[PDB]
Design a protein around this nucleic acid. Structure first.
Ligand SMILES: Nc1ncnc2c1ncn2[C@@H]1O[C@H](COP(=O)(O)OP(=O)(O)OP(=O)(O)O)[C@@H](O)[C@H]1O
Ligand SMILES: [K+]
Ligand SMILES: [K+]
Ligand SMILES: [K+]
Ligand SMILES: [Mg+2]
Ligand SMILES: [Mg+2]
Ligand SMILES: [Mg+2]
Ligand SMILES: [Mg+2]
Ligand SMILES: [Mg+2]
Ligand SMILES: [Mg+2]
Ligand SMILES: [Mg+2]
Ligand SMILES: [Mg+2]
Ligand SMILES: [Mg+2]
Ligand SMILES: [Mg+2]
Ligand SMILES: [Mg+2]
Ligand SMILES: [Mg+2]
Ligand SMILES: [Mg+2]
Ligand SMILES: [Mg+2]
Ligand SMILES: [Mg+2]
Lengths: 118, 53, 81, 164, 156, 103, 112, 134, 37, 105, 174
RNA sequence: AAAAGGGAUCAAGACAAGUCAUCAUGGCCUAAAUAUUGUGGGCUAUAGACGUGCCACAUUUUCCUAAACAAAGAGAUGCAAAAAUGUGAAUUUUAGCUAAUCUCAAAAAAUAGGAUAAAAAUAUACAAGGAUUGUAGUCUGAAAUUCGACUGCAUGAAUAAG
RNA sequence: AAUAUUUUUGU
């Protein structure tokens, strides 16, 4: 089916599909199914066409997309403009939470950027 | 099966009897600092003093 | 003070507001743990980094952070020359 | 040193009996049981506590409801299993001051229980502070009495017929 | 499972009681006497000890119905300070009969052991000495345990 | 279960090659190597179902393939039996009898 | 420096840091009730916001020697601060040599 | 206890207390070799029953006078009493004032001792010095 | 939104308006507070 | 032939049939499960630690009634007291005997 | 640039949907290898009520096994696939329960009973005997195999208009 | 009962083995400084590379439910019940015990059930995993910025057993 | 009994 322009297969739990968006987790998804009386073990192929439209119109009133990434990327850009210690570490691709840098800083160098993946 | 408001009447009768602070709302009154017993004199007497030589 | 219920960490600072048009020198301080309150948004600070005093101009964006967060103590590690 | 103690156990100990007194059981008015801990010539901070324990039923001036109200005011100081209100005090610098407090505090617990303002009869006695213990015992049906020997000889003979 | 708050959620994100479910609300009524079966019948509810939550309201009612039938002036009562009870479960289990199943008798154990031996699944001489052994290892004749010690063993 | 075991002497078969010599093994060592072969095949099979009977029914199906002579462990048995037959003369090799005799 | 007694009052192993830690234990003994009051006013959320901000500023002006976290047990025989056993006031090594000689009462080589 | 008429029960061997320490045999890098130390505390319990309160004190007084070296002692004394303890402890003032008539000779001080100051504060802070902190 | 976050957490007392900030900070500040700058 | 281990039955206490047979093994080897009632009271240890402990208890108690069964309980293994005990941890070892990693260089 | 060693990156048809779940929930009611018990009598419409059968094993009718199987009366935990013909021991509690059901339906009365007990003692199969006495005597049996499927939120649920109740359509159909 | 087991101990000598940074000590050096006091910083930096550890890469694992069984140790420089409050860290308030008494305190694996599968490779079926980071909080403490330990929400890297 | 891969250096 379709939810907010994203297509999901029939053999996919709605609980896991709603969680595929940036911003939705166990709490939000759990409350979005209860709002429309969808048991957690519901699969996409069983949702009627009218309820599928309600989910799309439900997520359109929430921060479930780049709107969320913007808030995260804006918080990192503000630390860089202010000149804080935490801002330099993002640009330099180094651990930002006071971690020993003598060894094992791989994931930091790969993900710490002013433009995060999300 | 006992109303909470009716239980606090008994909890308050104990406070008046045993002289304890009655704080049903859990307000931070800093009383944890008053109950803590001083440990100054225990630490000061660590290094022995100069005695007869 | 991390826990919010007991206010922020405040240290004595000579933040005396001058008359409009007067020249006030920057405040040299070593209290690198002083929370940046809103009362001195706009004053010029000179925070100690261990060896030197790095200039700082407090703005409305820094309210809440510590003064020591704007004066790096170590120098960036760079390999080669 | 052994002879020094043997000399004391042969010549000085017998003189202890001239100043000894016989034990007399407590009367009906002796309701309290105080405890005082000594360290025998040592200064320990815990030698100032005084523990007292009395039975609510020993106070023959209170009625059935005034005795139960006393158990509710005691709180975690009441042992439902043993039915004893135990309470200590080490708030003061001297044992004499800790005993006087518990002496006056018990007069307030009795004076408060006699207050007809609120009897707290609607409040059920709470015993969540105490952990009751379950004790097992040998089944009384397994005791090899003269009657059980006959009940076994019959069950043992009935099993032989089912097979035969 | 039907004597507690179900795991379902209503639009206000509030747990639904098991007795509110239309299907569970029917059996509960037939078990409580509200819905009268004109043509008669029987309404049996079997508990379970495997993958079963605990409901003090159900375990208490069972103790009250068994105590009353046993002719005792004193019957178990609620814990005045426990908040694990449910008034709905009490009214439903107020006038139900309780059938307590304990280990089978020594005569029933034999009839079941001889049926396993005649099938070749139990290669043992089934006598009184052999029926009283399985009756002990099975906790005074628990039929389920008697099968774990004579059928699902690693000796045969 | 195999009836023999191959134990080699380090560097006595030539230029750094071991002289594998067959030797018998008792019952316990025979049943151990056998069952451990059956498990090596069970651990390489793909999953089939669910429940507690998953691993038990996989081992039980291999015991049937063994008695029916349609298992792979039979090839592992004959592969070690051929080594002993081929190396049956190494028991009296000129190396195990001239280790350090001639100074 | 103002807390260092002008007349040495140590009878144990004296050192630069042993005399420095003994001066911190006496400064805190005299200021514990006064320091415990500032800590009580900072946490009392019932007092005015100004009373808590005042008590919070005075606690910052207290001398370092007054802070109890500065106190660190040391060895009375070697003056070290690393590996000190509270039950004996000595390093783990000094405890061994004295325990074997029999100077520490009750201690015994464990074997079981 | 037999001469004083006190029926004693014991000695009861209580569980011995064992404190353990594992220290390095070397004062330096050599950490791969350590050794275990301990301090076992052996204790006993003598419980007296149906004993007069005063006679129990003469017993405890006799053991402290002739105490054996290397032994510690801790006694818990139990006594029954009536209600209204405040009155009892005040009425017993004259009784204790007579028994102390010949014992006041132990203490002696200059008139209006000024070194004590606040009497109650002196005992509090002097008892700490005697016990070493507490 | 850092200013708004401070007001909600620590109240408007420390916030500059138009008042602990006026006297407490500068009041306790004195000359030669710390030698060596 | 009733057995109560600590107030509960043999099935409600030992959830493993291997332990039930080992607890009353003395009465099983001699074929006397149906002639004696046992009321055991165990304390400490684990499942197997308590199961095998009851084996030597019933055996010794059984000998008090029929002392002529020792030759049989001997071969059944219900007379010997197993002295095996957990070995203590030793300094320099991860466990009783497991040593940490050894680096040649 | 890094110079360490890094591992270089390097089969059968899968089961159909629901195949696995159907494998741990299948019920086997026979075993060819088992021997046919000589003297095994089958049940009758009035066989679970006679007290003379207490302690005897009787085989279930061939047609009742299809009815008991239609409403999932059996369960995988029960060991039925070890013997040839499904048979149940006529327990003493079976006669008491079945004698009450026979008197209830006789005079249009109703019995409301809760079978409580310990673990595998056999509560579940006592219902199987009650349902067996129902089919053989031309009764209407309405059995819910698992009560945890209605409360664990594993099936569709929908509300009713103007009421606090909730329906379970997918379950009510099956 | 018994074919018992473990711990400590384990020499001399050599390695001019390690320690003049525990202590102690001879010679040689500093003595307005190679001594002493405080504030802040640093010892926590990071291209490459080496050691020990934790944890994970789902089918004998993890996950959900339940009415089993331990030992040892700790609390006068203090261990904290019960209750109430909070989703949680935790808070409010102290009953008792300075202890075979009171408290930390609850064992887990297990046993027995139940849920989930094309459980990652056919992309509309992307598994398990919990690193990285955002944000809101709590606890200790003048003080948590360099540089603390935990908690909630969100984010969701490598990793096919080497 | 007649078997035999290679394997340097150390102020
Ligand atoms: N009356 C009986 N006749 C024949 N076999 C029986 C009988 N009762 C129980 N059994 C067998 O005993 C085992 C357990 O029975 P059952 O599953 O009904 O127990 P249960 O009480 O329902 O368990 P639980 O409380 O865990 O749900 C089964 O293998 C069953 O075949
Ligand atoms: K006092
Ligand atoms: K040597
Ligand atoms: K996942
Ligand atoms: Mg590394
Ligand atoms: Mg399992
Ligand atoms: Mg171990
Ligand atoms: Mg069942
Ligand atoms: Mg050298
Ligand atoms: Mg060197
Ligand atoms: Mg030197
Ligand atoms: Mg370091
Ligand atoms: Mg995990
Ligand atoms: Mg609590
Ligand atoms: Mg703990
Ligand atoms: Mg897979
Ligand atoms: Mg930090
Ligand atoms: Mg590996
Ligand atoms: Mg050379």
């Amino acid at each position: 089916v379709f939810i907010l322009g994203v297509n999901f297969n029939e053999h996919k739990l709605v609980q896991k599909a709603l969680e595929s968006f940036y911003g939705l987790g166990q709490q939000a998804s759990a409350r979005i199914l209860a709002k429309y009386s969808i048991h957690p073990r519901a699969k996409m192929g069983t949702l009627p066409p009218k309820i599928v439209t309600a989910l799309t119109a439900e997520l359109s009133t929430m921060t479930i997309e780049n709107d969320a990434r913007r808030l995260v990327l804006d918080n990192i850009k503000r630390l860089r403009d202010m000149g804080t210690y935490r801002g330099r570490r993002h640009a330099m691709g180094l651990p930002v939470r006071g971690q020993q840098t003598r060894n094992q800083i791989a994931n930091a160098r790969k993900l710490n950027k002013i433009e995060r993946h999300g | 099966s006992v109303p909470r408001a009716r239980l606090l009447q008994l909890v308050k009768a104990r406070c008046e009897l045993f002289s304890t602070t009655f704080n049903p709302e859990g307000i931070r009154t800093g009383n944890k600092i008053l109950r803590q017993r001083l440990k100054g004199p225990a630490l000061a007497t660590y290094y022995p003093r100069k005695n007869v030589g | 003070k991390r826990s919010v219920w007991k206010g922020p960490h405040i240290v004595p600072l000579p933040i005396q507001r001058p008359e409009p048009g007067k020249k006030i020198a920057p405040i040299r301080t070593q209290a690198r743990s002083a929370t940046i309150l809103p009362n001195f948004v706009g004053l010029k600070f000179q925070v100690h980094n261990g060896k030197d005093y790095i200039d700082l101009t407090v703005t409305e964006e820094m309210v809440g952070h510590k003064l020591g967060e704007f004066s790096a103590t170590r120098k960036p590690f760079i390999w080669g020359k | 040193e052994f002879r020094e103690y043997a000399r004391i156990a042969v010549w000085e100990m017998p003189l202890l009996s001239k100043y000894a007194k016989p034990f007399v059981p407590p009367t009906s008015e002796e309701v309290l049981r105080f405890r005082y801990t000594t360290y025998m010539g040592e200064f320990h901070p815990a030698d100032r506590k005084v523990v007292v324990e009395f039975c609510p039923k020993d106070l023959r001036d209170l009625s059935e409801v005034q005795q139960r109200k006393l158990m509710k005011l005691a709180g975690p100081r009441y042992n439902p299993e043993k039915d004893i209100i135990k309470m200590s005090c080490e708030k003061f610098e001297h044992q004499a001051q800790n005993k006087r407090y518990l002496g006056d505090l018990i007069e307030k617990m009795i004076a408060a229980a006699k207050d007809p303002k609120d009897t707290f009869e609607d409040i059920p006695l709470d015993t969540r502070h105490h952990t009751f213990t379950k004790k097992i015992s040998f089944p009384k049906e397994w005791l090899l009495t003269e009657e059980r020997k006959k009940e076994l000889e019959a069950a043992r003979q009935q099993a032989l017929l089912k097979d035969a | 499972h039907i004597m507690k708050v179900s795991d379902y959620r209503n639009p206000a994100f509030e747990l639904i009681h098991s007795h509110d479910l239309a299907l569970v609300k029917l059996f509960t009524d037939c078990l409580s006497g509200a819905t009268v079966m004109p043509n008669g019948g029987a309404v049996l509810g079997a508990t379970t000890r495997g993958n079963s939550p605990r409901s003090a309201s159900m375990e208490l009612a069972i103790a009250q119905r068994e105590a009353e039938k046993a002719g005792e002036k004193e019957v178990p009562q609620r814990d005045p300070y426990s908040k694990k009870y449910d008034d709905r479960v009490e009214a439903v289990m107020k006038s139900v009969e309780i059938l307590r199943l304990k280990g089978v008798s020594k005569t029933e154990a034999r009839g079941l052991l001889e049926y396993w031996a005649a099938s070749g699944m139990l290669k043992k001489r089934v006598d009184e000495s052999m029926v009283s052994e399985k009756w002990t290892l099975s906790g005074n004749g628990v039929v389920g345990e008697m099968e774990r010690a004579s059928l699902l063993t690693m000796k045969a | 279960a195999p009836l023999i075991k191959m134990r080699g002497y380090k560097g006595l078969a030539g230029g750094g090659r071991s002289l594998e010599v067959p030797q018998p093994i008792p019952a316990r060592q025979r049943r151990s190597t056998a069952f451990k072969w059956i498990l090596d095949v069970v651990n390489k099979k793909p999953s089939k179902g669910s429940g507690r009977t998953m691993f038990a029914h996989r081992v039980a199906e291999e015991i049937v393939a063994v008695v029916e002579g349609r298992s792979s462990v039979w090839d592992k048995r004959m592969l070690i039996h051929k080594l002993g037959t081929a190396n049956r003369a190494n028991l009296n090799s000129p190396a195990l009898q001239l280790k350090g005799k001639r100074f | 420096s103002m807390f260092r007694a002008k007349k040495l009052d140590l009878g144990c192993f004296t050192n630069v840091r042993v005399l420095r830690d003994h001066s911190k234990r006496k400064a805190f003994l005299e200021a514990e009730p006064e320091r415990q009051a500032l800590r009580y006013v900072i946490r009392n959320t019932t007092l005015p916001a100004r009373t808590r901000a005042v008590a919070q500023l005075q606690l910052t002006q207290m001398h370092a020697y007054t802070r109890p976290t500065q106190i660190r047990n040391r060895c009375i025989l070697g003056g070290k601060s690393r590996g000190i056993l509270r039950d004996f006031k000595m390093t783990r090594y000094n405890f061994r040599m004295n325990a074997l000689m029999g100077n520490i009462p009750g201690v015994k080589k464990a074997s079981w | 206890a037999y001469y004083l008429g006190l029926p004693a029960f014991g000695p009861v061997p209580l569980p011995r207390m064992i404190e353990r320490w594992t220290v390095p045999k070397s004062h330096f890098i050599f950490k791969k070799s350590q050794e275990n130390f301990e301090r076992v505390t052996l204790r006993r319990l003598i419980q007296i029953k149906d004993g007069h309160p005063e006679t129990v004190q003469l017993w405890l007084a006799f053991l402290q006078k002739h105490a054996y070296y290397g032994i510690g002692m801790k006694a818990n004394v139990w006594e029954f009493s009536k209600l209204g303890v405040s009155k009892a402890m005040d009425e017993s003032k004259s009784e204790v004032e007579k028994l102390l008539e010949t014992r006041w000779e132990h203490l002696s001080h200059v008139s209006d001792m000024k070194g004590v100051g606040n009497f109650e504060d002196f005992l509090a802070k002097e008892r700490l010095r005697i016990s070493g902190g507490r | 939104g850092k200013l708004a976050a401070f007001r909600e957490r620590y109240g408007r007392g420390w916030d500059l308006d138009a008042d602990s900030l006026t006297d407490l900070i500068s009041g306790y500040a004195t000359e030669n507070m710390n030698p060596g700058l | 032939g009733e057995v109560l281990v600590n107030g509960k039955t043999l099935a409600e206490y030992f959830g493993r049939v291997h332990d039930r047979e080992s607890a009353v093994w003395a009465l099983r080897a001699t074929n006397r499960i149906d002639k004696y009632n046992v009321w055991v009271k165990v304390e400490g240890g684990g499942t197997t630690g308590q199961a095998e402990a009851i084996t030597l208890a019933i055996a010794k108690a059984l000998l008090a009634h029929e002392p002529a069964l020792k030759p049989a309980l001997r071969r059944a293994g219900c007379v010997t007291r197993d002295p095996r005990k957990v070995e203590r941890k030793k300094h320099g070892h991860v466990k009783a005997r497991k040593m940490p990693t050894w680096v040649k260089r | 640039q890094k110079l360490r060693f890094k591992k270089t990156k390097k089969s059968g048809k899968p089961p159909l949907p629901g195949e696995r779940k159907a494998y741990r929930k299948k019920i086997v009611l026979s075993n060819n290898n088992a021997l046919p018990v000589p003297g095994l009598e089958t049940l009758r419409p009035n066989d679970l009520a006679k007290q003379d059968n207490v302690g005897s094993v009787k085989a279930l009718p061939e047609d009742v096994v299809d009815a008991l199987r239609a409403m999932e009366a059996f369960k995988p935990t029960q060991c039925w696939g070890i013997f040839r013909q499904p048979s149940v021991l006529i327990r003493q509690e079976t006669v008491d329960l079945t004698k009450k059901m026979k008197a209830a339906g006789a005079d249009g009365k109703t019995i409301r009973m809760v079978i409580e007990g310990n673990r595998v003692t056999g509560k579940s199969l006592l219902l199987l005997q009650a349902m067996t006495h129902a089919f053989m005597n031309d009764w209407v049996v309405l059995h819910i195999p698992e009560a945890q499927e209605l409360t664990t939120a594993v099936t569709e649920y929908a509300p009713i208009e103007n009421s606090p109740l909730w329906t379970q359509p997918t379950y009510t159909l099956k």
